[PDB]
């Protein structure tokens, strides 16, 4: 069946995040499709918080019937390991997937 949720609803749960530890790295993976790479702002703040922020222009000329895709994104991720303040964190974005690998010390 077809129950359509509000865009405001999706806003509070977008995006879905996988976080896990392997090989001395905290690997954070988020389904974050349809964004400009230069408009995705991710950073670890104060040793224990990963903040992912993104903005996009949604241009859809014509008549809207359904609108669920959010324009703004903000997700604070409780981080388990209070990672090091100093190390090099990787950040890739391909196929809509934002993958962030954080080194643990």
């Amino acid at each position: 069946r077809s129950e359509e949720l509000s865009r405001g609803f999706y806003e509070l749960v977008y995006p879905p995040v996988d976080m896990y530890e392997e090989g001395g790295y905290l690997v954070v993976v988020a389904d974050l499709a349809g964004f400009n790479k230069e408009k995705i702002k991710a950073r670890v703040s104060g040793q224990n918080e990963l903040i992912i922020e993104a903005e996009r222009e949604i241009t859809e000329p014509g008549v809207k019937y359904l609108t669920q895709r959010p324009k703004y994104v903000r997700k604070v991720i409780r981080l388990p390991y209070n990672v090091a303040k100093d190390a090099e964190i990787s950040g890739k974005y391909e196929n809509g997937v934002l993958t962030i690998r954080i080194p643990i010390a």
Binding site: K37, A42, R43, V44, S90, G91, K92
Partner: peptide, 5 residues
């Protein structure tokens, strides 16, 4: 801060 490549 983090570079998204």
């Amino acid at each position: 801060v983090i570079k998204i490549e």
